[PDB]
Design a protein around this ligand. Structure first.
Ligand SMILES: CC(=O)O[C@H]1C(=O)[C@@]2(C)[C@H]([C@H](OC(=O)c3ccccc3)[C@]3(O)C[C@H](OC(=O)[C@H](O)[C@@H](NC(=O)c4ccccc4)c4ccccc4)C(C)=C1C3(C)C)[C@]1(OC(C)=O)CO[C@@H]1C[C@@H]2O
Ligand SMILES: Nc1nc2c(ncn2[C@@H]2O[C@H](COP(=O)(O)OP(=O)(O)OP(=O)(O)O)[C@@H](O)[C@H]2O)c(=O)[nH]1
Ligand SMILES: Nc1ncnc2c1ncn2[C@@H]1O[C@H](COP(=O)(O)OP(=O)(O)NP(=O)(O)O)[C@@H](O)[C@H]1O
Ligand SMILES: Nc1nc2c(ncn2[C@@H]2O[C@H](COP(=O)(O)OP(=O)(O)O)[C@@H](O)[C@H]2O)c(=O)[nH]1
Ligand SMILES: [Mg+2]
Ligand SMILES: [Mg+2]
Lengths: 330, 6, 426, 428
């Protein structure tokens, strides 16, 4: 059957760098699923206000994806927004805090809990992959030797990264250790807007393969968790040197993603998936056999009104994309 | 190979 | 300043590069020994773009010639303009590829690509402001397609912010010189699409047509075809070497002529092109040059531009001419051929004028065209590839050197995606 | 003394500047070597004995044309530190001119300007020559204007741009560059005089009877116009006009500072005779829509302010008669809120004819700088081309790949739409 992309919007509290410089809250919320900026409606599935906690966003966004992955479908969650918007906070956040943990730790804990709650005749294999995109190069965040990798195609024409470290796991502790090791190798630079701005598009992959002993039925599952970098402007970021090169590549990749989203929204034919590595990897996520939810994080200050409008328009166009999701029966 | 079971 | 590293890979690339260097040296007044006996200072003004210096006013070109066989290198060396090259630059093995892309890209080419890269790196370090790279190869061969593709990938991953313009020779449609043309062509395109900035597609069929119809040559040879390719190779980068009223570098041409990253396959052209006994009757002027440039017979690729719509066109004029005349000619060409041009791009043509003509000519120009008609060549290559791949014909030679069928399917999918992209914008 | 700093950026800017400086040197009787065999301090500086150092900064990312200046006949005129060259061109990329490649010679040009400024006592303003559409003349000029606004600010800043023509065009990324630069430099420039190559081509075709105009003739015409603009400072006359006068008479509202220039009489040597070239005739011919230097009919709009700079043998009675005749005409439309939209300035120095030049020796000439609402349609067609290219998102990756957000295009489009709406509002 066909299912739509579930775009969800999150507005963070105003940060110190904006509250101390003549800024005003421009976002006005009505109902439970609409946001009004400069008297222009923008309707999404669920719009989270400033004070929304991590449990709320996880329960309203990603709890369905855990059950979908275990049942046999595929899932994808990725965050899009401006610099210092809340993508890293929404996805990962503080890794060990019971109240501040983001989407990834809650997803892994709930996937293990549902596995424990399943029937006794089933058997599961879980593998974890973690890589990033930097200067149009795919680097493995678990083994530094893999300086760059290649995106190939499968028999049924679904792209995938070749050579990424597939580490098997048994308990959530190993998953958390893998996440920590991947995060420590991720690239972080200090810009004016954000002190810990991420300069790479991190991707988290877990395959939950399912086998049944009695009925010999084998089911697959591919869950993608992506933390994109934000669009940056030299006037606000003040980048000079390596940071400027990172900003150039980040802007190019995000423009490619916007192009593919617009192409899917307009019902075109070419749907340019091949213009960037990120658009290649998430091809099945956007236009194939995946139930993907986009979590757009947007700054509510008057200083980022144009960027916030661009992000909301990107989310709005993505809501009309239709995906064809079918159970992966091997 | 490290399977998990309920 | 704004130097170009030149690479010749394979027999086709080497025999085109030899004529290219003879042509350039004649333009800059360099005799075969490496000395200078020119007539104007503008030759030596920008001699750094295509040459270096040495003691005693001797100029050695920054040409890097590579092949898996030494026969063509020996032919280049023993030729009339062979001693100008640096003897250390010739990098050659002894076992040829034998028209096997796998042999030239995985096993035999790998043992030479390291020293090739070392020569390239030394040349680039000796350069002041590296502008880009120039490569000549034939997609239908073994050493050319494979080794050039591997070297292009390595140089791209080493110098990601520099132009890589390659003058490749695509297989002819009607006549196939080698039985493995489809495989090699598809496997070469699968990486040319990703690792190049602007590639100029030439097929020998169009060159033979130009020679037979326009130049009226009774017995065209490979020398004449290589001469016509060298002409457009020199005309593309004329702004880098001489002053002009309006200057356009390779990156400027790329920005103008590449709307989307994967559509950078261009059809070259040149003008004027007349036969002896007909120059005394023609009229050398801008309208004649524009008419000859935009004609279908003058294109150096076997793709009729009428079966498609132009995306972007560059016209790198040369000599003394009025800018208003050029602009009016281009505008009326766009107006009279509105059907053959795209509407969501206004002012599809680009103009550059360099105030130095080639020797013996009052005016000259070069035509670079990004036409959706180039999908026909890729479509026929894909059709032949499918025909030869359904039945696994001529496949064990490639599979025996370490390739896989999945690589062939990936190459076919990439080619089909490029064809679909070109079809979309029509 | 009243002195101005002249800045030329990009190939068009430096060609125009070469023409302008040849005209200036001929005007003041200065040999190209810098040895004269007052009224020259405005554009030239004096050394201990002989050598005159023009107050010019020739800047370009392409070294080719500045090298032509360095090796040309005017080799020993400029202080070689003034002529600045980089390594690579901007490749018709606003991003390269502004963010990536521009921020490597911007410090040097700023230092050169500051050093020149410290040597001028009565600085009046800057004369920036650049071309919209080009990578350098749309990116580097924006950065330079931002720096000049931040540093000096109170000093005047005049621009002489080469606006893209409606039909005749050279680049394909020209609308993007033009809208980006007109969005960035709307808040900094104080009076930007715009011309387009198509109009000057037509003027040459119809008036000078030259069927093949080139860049040299266009640059000579622009040099004559700028000489008329700045001749009030150099020489004496009745009712001299300064740069602050230009700004405060030609700019009604702060966001409307894009006048269009016109020059007359542009005649050949053959037509120098058989024509009286009276003051009234020259003014009438200058108001004609065919003689405008921007491809826009003034009849489709209303004049806001128009300043006239007469040169040569001109008597105020003739000027008053001509202005009255112009006002009585019905085709010309002057806005309601400007009862007097005419400023005049008379100088006693006739225009000079460069040897080997198309123009002929004429007793009198005028330069009509008008601010009409007919310039809205040029912005309209430029915005239409930009929208057509941006709907399909063509060439965007080249700009995005050198440090420019995708939202900056939308911001520039919004600013241009605001400028169009403001022009429409002030019209009614
Ligand atoms: C008396 C006279 O004017 O003779 C001309 C001539 O008759 C014509 C027909 C020439 C002639 O060219 C050919 O016949 C030809 C042969 C093989 C391949 C291509 C062309 C000419 O041979 C070619 C030659 O070209 C040059 O000198 C250019 O500099 C040219 N040089 C070479 O290609 C070259 C040839 C041998 C050795 C070294 C260089 C060039 C063009 C572009 C960039 C660099 C160099 C010219 C003007 C002539 C002759 C001699 C008859 C033409 O070609 C060129 C390239 O100019 C053919 O159509 C043009 C028009 C010319 O008028
Ligand atoms: N009047 C006049 N216009 C010119 C001249 N040269 C170029 N132009 C116009 O300028 C535009 C091209 O921009 P250029 O100034 O050449 O480019 P640039 O500013 O040097 O920037 P880059 O070369 O890309 O670094 C086109 O619209 C040309 O018609 C000239 O000599 N005179
Ligand atoms: N919901 C939130 N509540 C409180 N603080 C938040 C919230 N979202 C983000 N922040 C703060 O903003 C800073 C983080 O920006 P982050 O949310 O990490 O930006 P980012 O989206 O990862 N920036 P970038 O990597 O450039 O796209 C942190 O120190 C957070 O504490
Ligand atoms: N113009 C020209 N084409 C050539 C030459 N030699 C080979 N070709 C063409 O190149 C293709 C063969 O590839 P080739 O370069 O010989 O194989 P390689 O040595 O393995 O790269 C065929 O289409 C030939 O017609 C030459 O000297 N000049
Ligand atoms: Mg981050
Ligand atoms: Mg230039």
């Amino acid at each position: 059957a066909e299912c739509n992309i579930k775009v969800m919007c999150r507005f963070r509290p105003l940060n110190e760098s904006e509250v101390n410089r003549g800024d005003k809250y421009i976002a006005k919320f009505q109902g439970e699923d609409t946001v009004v900026i400069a008297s222009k409606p923008y309707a999404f599935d669920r719009v989270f206000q400033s004070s929304t906690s991590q449990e709320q966003v996880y329960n309203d966004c990603a709890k369905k994806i855990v059950k979908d992955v275990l049942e046999g479908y595929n899932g994808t969650i990725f965050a899009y927004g401006q610099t210092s918007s809340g993508k890293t906070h929404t996805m990962e956040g503080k890794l060990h805090d019971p109240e501040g943990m983001g989407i990834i730790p809650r997803i892994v804990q709930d996937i293990f809990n549902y596995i424990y709650s399943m029937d006794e005749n089933l058997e599961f294999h879980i593998k974890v992959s973690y890589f990033e995109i930097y200067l149009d190069k795919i680097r493995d965040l678990l083994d530094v030797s893999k300086t760059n990798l290649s995106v190939h195609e499968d028999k049924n024409r679904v792209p995938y990264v070749k050579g990424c470290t597939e580490r098997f796991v048994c308990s959530p502790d190993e998953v958390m250790d893998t996440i920590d090791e991947g995060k420590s190798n991720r690239h972080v630079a200090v810009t004016n807007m954000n002190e810990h701005s991420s300069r790479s598009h991190s991707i988290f992959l877990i395959n939950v393969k399912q086998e049944n002993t009695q009925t010999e039925q084998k089911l697959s599952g591919k869950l993608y968790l992506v933390d994109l970098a934000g669009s940056e402007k030299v006037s606000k970021t003040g980048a000079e040197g390596a940071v400027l090169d990172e900003a150039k590549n980040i802007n190019k990749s995000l423009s490619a993603l916007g192009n593919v989203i617009s192409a899917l929204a307009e019902g075109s034919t070419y749907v340019p998936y091949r213009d960037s590595k990120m658009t290649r990897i998430l091809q099945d996520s956007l236009g194939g056999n995946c139930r993907t939810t986009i979590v757009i994080c947007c700054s509510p200050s008057s200083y980022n009104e144009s960027e916030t409008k661009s992000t909301l328009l990107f989310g709005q166009r993505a809501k009309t994309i239709k995906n064809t999701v079918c159970v992966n029966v091997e | 190979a490290k399977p998990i079971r309920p | 300043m704004r130097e170009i590293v030149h690479i010749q890979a394979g027999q086709c690339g080497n025999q085109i590069g030899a004529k290219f260097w003879e042509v350039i040296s004649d333009e800059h007044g360099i005799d075969p020994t490496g000395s200078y006996h020119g007539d104007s200072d503008l030759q030596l003004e920008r001699i750094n773009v295509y040459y270096n210096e040495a003691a005693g006013n001797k100029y050695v070109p920054r040409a890097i010639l590579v092949d898996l066989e030494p026969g063509t290198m020996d032919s280049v060396r023993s030729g009339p303009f062979g001693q100008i090259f640096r003897p250390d630059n010739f990098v050659f093995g002894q076992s040829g590829a034998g028209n096997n892309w796998a042999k030239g890209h995985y096993t035999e080419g790998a043992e030479l690509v390291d020293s090739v890269l070392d020569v390239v790196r030394k040349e680039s370090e000796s350069c002041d402001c590296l502008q880009g790279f120039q490569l000549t190869h034939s997609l239908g061969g073994g050493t050319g397609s494979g080794m050039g593709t591997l070297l292009i990938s390595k140089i791209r991953e080493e110098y990601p912010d520099r132009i890589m313009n390659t003058f490749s020779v695509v297989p002819s449609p009607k006549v196939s010189d080698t039985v493995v043309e489809p495989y090699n062509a598809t496997l070469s395109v699968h990486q040319l699409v990703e690792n190049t900035d602007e590639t100029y597609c030439i097929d020998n069929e169009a060159l033979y047509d130009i020679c037979f119809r326009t130049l009226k040559l009774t017995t065209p040879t490979y020398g004449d075809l290589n001469h016509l390719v060298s002409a457009t190779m020199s005309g593309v980068t004329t702004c880098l070497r001489f002053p002009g009223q309006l200057n356009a570098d390779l990156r400027k041409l790329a920005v103008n002529m590449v709307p989307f990253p994967r559509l950078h396959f261009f059809m070259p052209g040149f003008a004027p092109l007349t036969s002896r006994g007909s120059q005394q009757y023609r009229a050398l002027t801008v309208p004649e040059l524009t008419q000859q440039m935009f004609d279908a017979k003058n294109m150096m690729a076997a793709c009729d531009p009428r079966h498609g719509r132009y995306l972007t066109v560059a016209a790198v004029f040369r000599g003394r001419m009025s800018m208003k005349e050029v602009d009016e000619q281009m505008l009326n060409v766009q107006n009279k051929n509105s059907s053959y041009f795209v509407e969501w791009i206004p002012n599809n043509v680009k103009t550059a004028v360099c105030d130095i003509p080639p020797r013996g000519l009052k005016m000259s120009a070069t035509f670079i065209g990004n036409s959706t008609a180039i999908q026909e060549l890729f479509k026929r290559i894909s059709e032949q590839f499918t025909a030869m791949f359904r039945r696994k014909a001529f496949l064990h030679w490639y599979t025996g050197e370490g390739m896989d069928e999945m690589e062939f399917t990936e190459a076919e999918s990439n080619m089909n995606d490029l064809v679909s992209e070109y079809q979309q914008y029509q | 003394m009243r002195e101005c700093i002249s800045i030329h950026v990009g190939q068009a800017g430096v060609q125009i500047g070469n023409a302008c400086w040849e005209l200036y040197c001929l005007e003041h009787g200065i040999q190209p070597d810098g040895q004269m065999p007052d009224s020259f301090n405005t554009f030239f500086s004096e050394t201990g004995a002989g050598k005159h150092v023009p107050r010019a900064v020739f800047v370009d990312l392409e070294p080719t044309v500045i090298d032509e200046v360095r090796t040309g006949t005017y080799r020993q005129l400029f202080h070689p530190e003034q002529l600045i060259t980089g390594k690579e061109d901007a490749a018709n990329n606003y991003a390269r001119g502004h963010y990536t490649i521009g921020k490597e010679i911007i410090d040097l040009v700023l230092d050169r300007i500051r050093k020149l400024a410290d040597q001028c006592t009565g600085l009046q303003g800057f004369l920036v020559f650049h071309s919209f559409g080009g990578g350098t003349g749309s990116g580097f000029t924006s950065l330079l204007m931002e720096r000049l606004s931040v540093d000096y600010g109170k000093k005047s800043k005049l621009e002489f741009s080469i606006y893209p023509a409606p039909q005749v065009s050279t680049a394909v990324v020209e609308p993007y560059n033009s809208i980006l630069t007109t969005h960035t430099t709307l808040e900094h420039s104080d009076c930007a005089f715009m011309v387009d190559n198509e109009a000057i081509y037509d003027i040459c075709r119809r008036n000078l009877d030259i069927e093949r105009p080139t860049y040299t003739n266009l640059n000579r015409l622009i040099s004559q116009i700028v000489s008329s603009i700045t001749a009030s400072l150099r020489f004496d006359g009745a009712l001299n006009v300064d740069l602050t006068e230009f700004q405060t008479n030609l700019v009604p509202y702060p966001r409307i500072h894009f006048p269009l220039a016109t020059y007359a009489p542009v005649i050949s040597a053959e037509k120098a005779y058989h024509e009286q070239l009276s003051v009234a005739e020259i003014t009438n011919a200058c108001f004609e829509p065919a003689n405008q230097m921007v491809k826009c009919d003034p009849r489709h709009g209303k004049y806001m302010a128009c300043c006239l700079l007469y040169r040569g043998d001109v008597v105020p009675k003739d000027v008053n008669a001509a202005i009255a005749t112009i006002k009585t005409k019905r085709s010309i439309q002057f806005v309601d809120w400007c009862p007097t939209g005419f400023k005049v300035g008379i100088n006693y120095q006739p225009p000079t004819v460069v040897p080997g030049g198309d123009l002929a020796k004429v007793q009198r000439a005028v330069c009509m700088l008008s601010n009409t609402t007919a310039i809205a349609e040029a912005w309209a067609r430029l915005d239409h081309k930009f929208d057509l290219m941006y709907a399909k998102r063509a060439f965007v990756h080249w700009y995005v790949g050198e440090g420019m957000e995708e939202g900056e295009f939308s911001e520039a489009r919004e600013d241009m739409a605001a400028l169009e709406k403001d022009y429409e509002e002030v019209g009614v």
